[PDB]
Ligand binder design. Structure first.
Ligand SMILES: O=C(O)CCCC[C@@H]1SC[C@@H]2NC(=O)N[C@@H]21
Ligand SMILES: O=C(O)CCCC[C@@H]1SC[C@@H]2NC(=O)N[C@@H]21
Ligand SMILES: O=C(O)CCCC[C@@H]1SC[C@@H]2NC(=O)N[C@@H]21
Ligand SMILES: O=C(O)CCCC[C@@H]1SC[C@@H]2NC(=O)N[C@@H]21
Lengths: 119, 119, 119, 119
């Protein structure tokens, strides 16, 4: 029930398939930034989703490289799937770009994203 | 040259193999926290490493679930491999645990790690 | 126009007064967590608010200590006041608790908050 | 014992005076970035420092504005003073710049700093 075609508040598309062991595959099309295509993602999530009423912890990784453009950067999301009547995924994310060792302090960006299934 | 057996400042072990397309596989044994084994990791990195003199951006994901213990949590690293005479990987990371919707604010932890190849 | 009585999505109250030089004073009552009173905050913001159409960058600090309860912790917000028809303040924040040197990795928590003036 | 003249790993200077109530005043000269002077800081820390053996939680705020240059940005540190034979302050920090509402995702930067008293 974690697989599907999620959107978020910036408008970017996140097509995902969960795995039997805990794998996470799919593509990710950022609607904003230095990117124009679907990009490859990979990540993991636990499969024992703590049935007391909590959300399923998950995380994944995208590196901004394909046939069209490269930004030499990588972004990781970590969040929790809150699954109920409103299927929601709240994530918080990092973005690291490849900089020179002088510009090491300003490499990382942080932010948040709210993923909804049927927009 | 990104593959290998890295340690860090907490003492945890990170066995990694890079990929021809940009995949990243291997295991991760946290020496601290609610974990006792090697755990499965998966992530990505770009393969056009920007030969002006910058580091290679990379990121990966571990979900704390195996045959021994489960913490219902997932952690993601994003950083850059600085490769020279001293092979170094500086990463900054998030840790998300599966909480109830009341305790949504205190789910995520942030921190930093400094990975060295030959300790 | 930054001064006033803001609420947020968790329900916590943030009473603030800006300064002529750039100071920021007021109180902060967290509606959730290990706190029960108004707490003291202090922070800063720039006063040249970049009239091209951007938001005003700001930040502040609260330490969870008063006559009622102490948590030995400190939280800092950094965000930007987007001021228009809908007066909004989006912030992203850190929370650090005083831990032993063994438990240094799990001290910091990260999160986000969305402040609205008239709720 | 928190007051004094701290340096860090980037070379920036942090002159600080603690307060009887819990206030924190002083100046901050960033040795790197879009800044050239001492800048004004303000923040807070708790004064009941948990004498079991933990560090003192603290945090502060700087807004990059003075007579010389303005960057329309604000940075906040949150960390813990580990005080022993080696007086250390480990902090983790955010940096928010005033951007247009389109460029809201890439406003914030995250990073870490390690402050030492006698360098
Ligand atoms: O910044 C870059 O170098 C490329 C653009 C990255 C897009 C970011 S990644 C996190 C955030 N969420 C998105 O869907 N897109 C932005
Ligand atoms: O907190 C948990 O629920 C399990 C322990 C997680 C270990 C964390 S993950 C990030 C940091 N780096 C490590 O090598 N271990 C800790
Ligand atoms: O965790 C603690 O030790 C005390 C509770 C802190 C409340 C946090 S601070 C950030 C977030 N925003 C709020 O208005 N409250 C929570
Ligand atoms: O980026 C800017 O707009 C101005 C430069 C800010 C300097 C940053 S703030 C955090 C980090 N620690 C420092 O001592 N300097 C950098």
């Amino acid at each position: 029930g974690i697989t599907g075609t999620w959107y978020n508040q910036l408008g970017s598309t996140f097509i995902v398939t969960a795995g039997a062991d805990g794998a996470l595959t799919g593509t990710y099309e950022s609607a904003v930034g230095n990117a124009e295509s679907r990009y490859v993602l990979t990540g993991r999530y636990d499969s024992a989703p703590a049935t007391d009423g909590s959300g399923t912890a998950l995380g994944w990784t995208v590196a901004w490289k394909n046939n069209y453009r490269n930004a030499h950067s990588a972004t990781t999301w970590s969040g929790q799937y809150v699954g109920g009547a409103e299927a929601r995924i709240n994530t918080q994310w990092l973005l690291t770009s490849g900089t020179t060792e002088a510009n090491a302090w300003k490499s990382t960006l942080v932010g948040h994203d709210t993923f909804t299934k049927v927009k």
